[PDB]
Amino acid sequence: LGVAQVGRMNFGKDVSTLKYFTICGLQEGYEPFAVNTNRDITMWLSKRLPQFLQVPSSHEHIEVTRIDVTQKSFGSQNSSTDIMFYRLSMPIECTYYYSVRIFPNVWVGWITSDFHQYDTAFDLVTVTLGDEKGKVHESIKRSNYMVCANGLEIGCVVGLLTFTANGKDLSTYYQVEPSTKLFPAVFAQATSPNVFQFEAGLFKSEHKNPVPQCPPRLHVQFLSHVLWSRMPNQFLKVDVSRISERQGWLVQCLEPLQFMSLHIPEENRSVDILELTEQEELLKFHYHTLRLYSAVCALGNHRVAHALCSHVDEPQLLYAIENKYMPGLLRAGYYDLLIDIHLSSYATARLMMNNEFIVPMTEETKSITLFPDGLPGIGLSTSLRPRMQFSSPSFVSINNECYQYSPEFPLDILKAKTIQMLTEAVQEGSLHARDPVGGTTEFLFVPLIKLFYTLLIMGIFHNEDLKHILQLIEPSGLLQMKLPEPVKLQMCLLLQYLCDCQVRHRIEAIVAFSDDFVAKLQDNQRFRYNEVRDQLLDFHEDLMTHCGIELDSDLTIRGRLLSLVEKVTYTLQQLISETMVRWAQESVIEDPELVRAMFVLLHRQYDGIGGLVRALPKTYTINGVSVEDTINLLASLGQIRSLLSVRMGKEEEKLMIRGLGDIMNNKVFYQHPNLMRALGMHETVMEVMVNVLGFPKMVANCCRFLCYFCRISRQNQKAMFDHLSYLLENSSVGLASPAMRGSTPLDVAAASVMDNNELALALREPDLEKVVRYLAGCGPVEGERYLDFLRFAVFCNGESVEE
Amino acid sequence: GVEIETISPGDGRTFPKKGQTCVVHYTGMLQNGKKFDSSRDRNKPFKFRIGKQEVIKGFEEGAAQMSLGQRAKLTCTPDVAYGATGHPGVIPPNATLIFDVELLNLE
Amino acid sequence: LSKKAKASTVDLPIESVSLSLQDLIGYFHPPDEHLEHEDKQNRLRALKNRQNLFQEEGMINLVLECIDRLHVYSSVAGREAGESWKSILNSLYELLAALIRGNRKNCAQFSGSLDWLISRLERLEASSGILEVLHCVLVESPEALNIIKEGHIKSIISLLDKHGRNHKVLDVLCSLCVCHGVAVRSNQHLICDNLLPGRDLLLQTRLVNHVSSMRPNIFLGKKWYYELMVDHTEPFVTAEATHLRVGWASTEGYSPYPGGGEEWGGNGVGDDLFSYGFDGLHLWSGCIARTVSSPNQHLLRTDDVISCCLDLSAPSISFRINGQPVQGMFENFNIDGLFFPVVSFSAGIKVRFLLGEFKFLPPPGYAPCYEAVLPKEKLKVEHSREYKQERTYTRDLLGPTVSAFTPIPVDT
């Protein structure tokens, strides 16, 4: 535009207002812009107010030099050497001098950043108070901003303000400024080239961190900015809803509409966030700051999660989800940050416990059918389901904030917003809408699906929205569309979790039927004994012989229930395989993790037996009476599995010992070695003990627990047997021999032998070879451990096993 | 110690007692103007108890000073607050608090 | 050059060593991305073998000795030899970055000299090479993560505040933050104790409601006056606290960019806006609020009327509440151009214009806008200079502008 003129532009979206383009244009082959999209296009018009920009090499000719007292020269060998302002970079807090030298008309002051005057003169502030009339009321303000005029001039530090001039003192010093910030500011009317030189320390004391600060220095961060006229700036996308009158003039706006901003603090100025799409250095840097914030609260630092909730303040993230113009890097960053604060702890806990399947035998866990004549999201599953608890990050209190769990968020509101996001995105990004939310379809889709996946894991979305999203994707569409690579690499985990929930439903149903069937056949055992040589051989022979001479008892009721289960074993199973083959037949694949996940899902479709093969020897049933200790031990064991991957680890061992002592004191650990052996928790504790060695009190605390685990059942002792060679090569000095003597790795190895004759016969010769290699003493003391282990290796039963 | 402007008066006389539920909305930014906490913003009306010694001393004495429905600027001394040691991560060492607190209900 | 300068100087290769040095940088170049997978593995296996040939000869220690004995000057000899100095340093640290990036064994061999490199980190000339060497070491050695302690990290936090703002520093700090598989939690406690709390070293986000600023369409240069009234406030449309502002300005100065001017746009923020309205009824000036009280102590609530006057022959502004003194505000301020009331807010708030319809008029000043309707307009109201205008067909646009009571007769 020029002086007082009007623009009228059409960037697509305006087929109803094409004045001449259906006439000529579209017929010849041209196009509008935004035919597909719903968005507008923002415009970066020119501003008016000057903001002091950096100094490029591409000036006309004005060139500063970086010279170490710490001087910055000039040169302007041109024609136009008149109007060039020069504000400097970094401010003063509210003692140290700062001298300016001129080689041959020159203003010197201390400018606060609220200053944009583009005028060549001395131009431009006395607020009043009251004691209901005043009487002092006036010592307030003059700054708007600050002007003085080979000379050497110093605005020294502290607080007050100082005006000196070549040793002499010019008058009218403005020594009153309580809480502002100032810049060393020198303008220019360059009468000649070689016009300035700049600088018992200096401003390096004031600005930077250290303040002994006796040697002064210009750092690299010190720029020498030039107040250029304008930059392109954004367009204030939605502004006005004025309702008013003209007799009464009821001028009224009722707008919930917020900005989204930041300010670079070192050159203080507020800037809105979503303008930054072209400020690529600041883009990359604030992206990396979000990535660091995601890195910091990774896997358990919940105290620091409270800290980041103080910083970034979760409803700000909620507004950051909705913004349909924020760039994709900020989009991925904030989508990661909401996860890595509020979700990933309970998420990774359930990801660890997704292979345990244990379920009590109560009344709710009993009325479950098989699939009748696609809905895995049913009402079921009190199968021990480690519950979720949260915190409330206030910043006034104590007790304790370091074990407190995780910060909160608007749960159902969040899931409704994600449902809205998914539906509206699927409706938009289908026809090649040439403007996605973040620029491409990857930043559009990928972290949305990541958030939806991690939210789907967390046991939210009661069954209505499950039906909604399923036959949104199913209809029986989402997956049927054309998609890029990491999008479906994300979606494969959705399909994983769907099939896994199907497996959970399947196993809970088979446990219910097993309860009914065992009740019936237990009564049949009662009557078959009460009718009268096949006595119990430890009750495994009884069930094995029941299924063995019943490999087709042998009542027809038994055969009917057998046929009932073998028709329980018999429409997603179609479409998953169909679409995996469909993807792989067309779209020659990179990122081999995608190939991995695809074909793992494909084999897992065709081996529905095999999941039930490798799932059932890790499930277990509880009576229903002692469930509270089971919840407590599952919570303790989940947080000790999370403690496995700290890794180092020097002061969380207090939490480790507290957890292990509770696992000791839990009642279920006494009577249920099936459950403890089923959790794999001995191997967990053992690998923790591996990680501790290649010497604190942690080792003996582990070895005590292994030894107490070796003394509850024989099959437990078989389980703790086979670690002998590694446990032996650990056991050289590892514990017990200042005077500790309670447990040690060698004490664990001896703890797995003492009862059973069978394990005494099972062990072999190179182990004892390594033991007598370790018997290479010269004095001493710790050979008593080797001899003690051999004593437990030779005799064991009242007579020595002679081999 | 601490000097607190009543921004807006509440009912003036209803100052609480130890054993009465201190249902509050509050927020607060630092001396520089940067925010650090906002119980307004997560839409949780905060509760505590004076005498049960739940909050910092400046916020406790300011809640003791105010009345029902009294929005007030509770600028507090840093050494009454965390102050020198600071809240390690949230509040820097030796920073003065500036509040915006209004009492809601009493039980 | 420890003691003497003659000949000058000595058999002392410059271009020979630098040529051989660029050759050796090109020697250990990583295998490319657009190479076939088996050829990639061939080049990669031979590259790791060529590194393991150098580790078991201690050549890196020889490089460290050359680092020891080169870091002397600040830019000597026959001073073409001192002119290649930046290139020799840059190439040596690039070569040091080359010899570690693959093997876990070599960055395990760098258990020793890491703290000395953090000491050399403050040369403040060549942060790039030392930083990249340190990053590639910290990635692949979980040994050296057990080494590094508080003073190192405090120096690295200070390193950005020396050298401005580098994302590569944040890549380094993220690498310190998380191992190959695990973390180290006390290290992260140290990070968030020593970097965040104070919010100055890096950025900080915040959002606020869009601020609406309006004006009654009439430039006004004669003791001026106006009257408005608050009708409904409800100050918590969102959890952000809202605001009401009443004051004077001109467009000659303070280009009114809403949000994009001073902080949040707003009012009382520039060298023309002189705002009013609080509870504890003080003002803003340059987006700074100092703390005038008055014996009313009331907000701008739903039934409030504000006396609003501008002063002739003294550039002075003083406002009142229902005529009652609010300890009068402004005296002896700046003068240019034609002024107007710039009464502003950002909320769900309705107000009125009492400019003809009146309630209130005291004789501290008298020139209302209803008594200056004369020049061109009638009583109309606009939206503060409006570089936009919004529709649903086409947001049209506007050119910039072409913008007293002592007239000019012909001087005869």
DSSP for C46-103 reads: HHHHHHHHHHTTTHHHHHHHHHHHHTT-----STTTTTSHHHHHHHHHHHHHHTTSS-
Q: Which residue in chain B has the smallest CA separation from C300?
A: B8
Task: Select from A418, A600, A421 the least CA-distant residue to A495.
Answer: A600
Q: Which amino acid is at C208?
A: V
Asked if A130 and C269 come within 8 Å (Cβ–Cβ), the reply is: no
Q: Are C388 and C256 in contact (CB under 8 A)?
A: no
Q: Are C262 and A269 in contact (CB under 8 A)?
A: no
Q: Are C99 and C51 in contact (CB under 8 A)?
A: yes
Per DSSP, which regions of A533-683 are E strands?
621-622
Task: Select from A606, A380, A386, A672 the least CA-distant residue to A510.
Answer: A380
Q: How far apart are CA A238 and CA A260, in angstroms?
A: 13
- Per-residue CA distances from A209 to A408, C152, C159, C204 (Å): 36, 16, 11, 19
Q: Is B92 near chain C, with CB under 8 Å?
A: yes
Q: How far apart are CA A630 and CA A636, in angstroms?
A: 10
User: Closest approach of chain A CAs to the CA of B26, in angstroms?
Assistant: 10
From the list A7, A285, A291, the residue facing C397 with the nearest CB is A7
From the list A131, A140, A286, the residue facing C203 with the nearest CB is A286
Any bridge partners for residue A164, and if so which? A154
Q: How far apart are CA C311 and CA C321, in angstroms?
A: 17
Burial of A651 (0-12, 13-18, 19+ CB in 10 A): exposed
Q: Is B88 near chain C, with CB under 8 Å?
A: yes
Asked if C210 and A651 come within 8 Å (Cβ–Cβ), the reply is: no
Residues of A in contact with B59 (CB under 8 A): 396
Residues of B in contact with C200 (CB under 8 A): none
Any bridge partners for residue A148, and if so which? A108
Q: Is A408 near chain B, with CB under 8 Å?
A: yes
Task: Select from A139, A126, A144, A178 the least CA-distant residue to C329.
Answer: A126
The conformational region for residue A433 under phi > 0 = left, psi -120 to 50 = alpha, else beta, is: beta
Asked if A307 and B90 come within 8 Å (Cβ–Cβ), the reply is: yes
Taking the CA atoms of B70, B76, B81 and B83 in sequence, report the sign of the dihedral they define: positive
Residues of C in contact with A140 (CB under 8 A): 290
Q: How far apart are CA C103 and CA C140, in angstroms?
A: 8
Q: Which residue in chain A has the smallest CA separation from B41?
A: A315
Write the CB contacts of A104 (distance below 8 Å, at least 6 apart in sequence).
A191, A192, A195
Q: Are A98 and A71 in contact (CB under 8 A)?
A: no
Give the single-character DSSP code of C244.
Answer: E
From the list A303, A310, A410, the residue facing B36 with the nearest CB is A310
Helix axis angle for A280-296 and C185-194, nearest 10°, is 130
Neighbours of chain C (3+ CB pairs under 8 A): A, B
Can you list the alpha helix ranges (DSSP code H) found in B19-79? 57-65
From the list C163, C188, C329, the residue facing A127 with the nearest CB is C329
Do the strands A359-360 and A621-622 form a parallel or antiparallel pair, or are they unpaired? parallel
Residue written as token pair 């029986």? A476
- What method was applied to determine this entry? cryo-EM
Q: How far apart are CA C185 and CA A646, in angstroms?
A: 7
Q: Which two tokens stand for residue A214?
A: 């006796």
User: Closest approach of chain A CAs to the CA of B49, in angstroms?
Assistant: 11
Helix axis angle for C150-162 and C185-194, nearest 10°, is 40
Q: How far apart are CA B49 and CA C340, in angstroms?
A: 51
Asked if B34 and C204 come within 8 Å (Cβ–Cβ), the reply is: yes
Helix, strand, coil fractions of chain C, as percent rounded to 5: 30, 10, 55
Q: Is A261 near chain B, with CB under 8 Å?
A: no
Q: Which two tokens stand for residue A566?
A: 């073998």
Task: Select from A558, A569, A680 the least CA-distant residue to A618.
Answer: A680
Asked if C239 and B41 come within 8 Å (Cβ–Cβ), the reply is: yes
Asked if A255 and C210 come within 8 Å (Cβ–Cβ), the reply is: yes
Q: Are A89 and A266 in contact (CB under 8 A)?
A: yes
With residue A770 as reference, give the H or E element that holds it: helix A765-774
From the list A251, A255, A284, the residue facing C381 with the nearest CB is A251
What residues of B act catalytically? 26, 36-37, 56, 82, 99
Burial of C98 (0-12, 13-18, 19+ CB in 10 A): buried
Q: Are A371 and A510 in contact (CB under 8 A)?
A: no
Termini Cα distance of chain B: 28
Q: Which two tokens stand for residue A66?
A: 């970086």
Instruction: Extract long-range pairs of A277-282: CB within 8 Å, 24+ residues apart.
Output: A277/A327, A278/A44, A278/A232
Q: Which amino acid is at C390?
A: E
How many interchain CB pairs under 8 A, B with C?
A: 36
Q: How far apart are CA A612 and CA C278, in angstroms?
A: 70
From the list B44, B56, B89, the residue facing A396 with the nearest CB is B56
With residue A165 as reference, give the H or E element that holds it: strand A164-165
Q: How far apart are CA C172 and CA C130, in angstroms?
A: 11
Asked if C196 and B89 come within 8 Å (Cβ–Cβ), the reply is: yes
Q: Which amino acid is at C40?
A: K
Q: Which residue in chain C has the smallest CA separation from B26?
A: C239
Query: How crowded is residue A633: how many other Cβ atoms within 10 Å of its Cβ?
Result: 22
Residues of A in contact with C327 (CB under 8 A): 128-134, 137
Taking the CA atoms of C33, C39, C44 and C47 in sequence, report the sign of the dihedral they define: negative
Cis ω on the peptide bond leading into residue C385 (within 30° of 0)? no
The sheet carrying C212-213 orders its strands as C212-213, C344-345, C244-245
Q: How far apart are CA A27 and CA C184, in angstroms?
A: 66
Gyration radius of chain B over CA positions: 13
Q: Which amino acid is at C233?
A: T
Q: Are C257 and C273 in contact (CB under 8 A)?
A: no
A222-260: burial string, b at 16+ Cβ within 10 Å, e else: bbbbbbeeeeebbbbbebbeeebeeeebebbbebebbbb
Q: What is the resolution of the experimental data for this entry, in Å?
A: 4.2
Q: Is B41 near chain C, with CB under 8 Å?
A: yes
Asked if B44 and A310 come within 8 Å (Cβ–Cβ), the reply is: no
Q: How far apart are CA C141 and CA C103, in angstroms?
A: 9
| φ/ψ of residue C226, rounded to 5 | -160, 170
Neighbours of chain B (3+ CB pairs under 8 A): A, C
Q: Are A242 and C210 in contact (CB under 8 A)?
A: no
Asked if A14 and C177 come within 8 Å (Cβ–Cβ), the reply is: no
Q: Which residue in chain A has the smallest CA separation from C167?
A: A285
Q: Are B87 and B10 in contact (CB under 8 A)?
A: no
SS3 C345: strand
Q: Is B38 near chain A, with CB under 8 Å?
A: yes
Q: Is B47 near chain A, with CB under 8 Å?
A: no
Asked if A285 and C165 come within 8 Å (Cβ–Cβ), the reply is: yes
User: Closest approach of chain B CAs to the CA of A455, in angstroms?
Assistant: 20
Q: Which two tokens stand for residue A302?
A: 């919940």
Neighbours of chain A (3+ CB pairs under 8 A): B, C
How many interchain CB pairs under 8 A, A with B?
A: 35
Asked if C161 and A208 come within 8 Å (Cβ–Cβ), the reply is: yes
From the list A130, A248, A264, the residue facing C203 with the nearest CB is A264
Q: How far apart are CA A303 and CA C185, in angstroms?
A: 11
C188-205: burial string, b at 16+ Cβ within 10 Å, e else: bbbbbebbbbbbebbbbb
Instruction: Extract long-range pairs of A620-623: CB within 8 Å, 24+ residues apart.
Output: A620/A357, A620/A358, A620/A672, A620/A674, A620/A675, A620/A678, A621/A358, A621/A359, A621/A360, A621/A361, A621/A511, A621/A515, A622/A358, A622/A359, A622/A360, A622/A361, A622/A384, A622/A668, A623/A360, A623/A361
Q: How far apart are CA A508 and CA C376, in angstroms?
A: 84
Per DSSP, which regions of A616-672 are E strands?
621-622
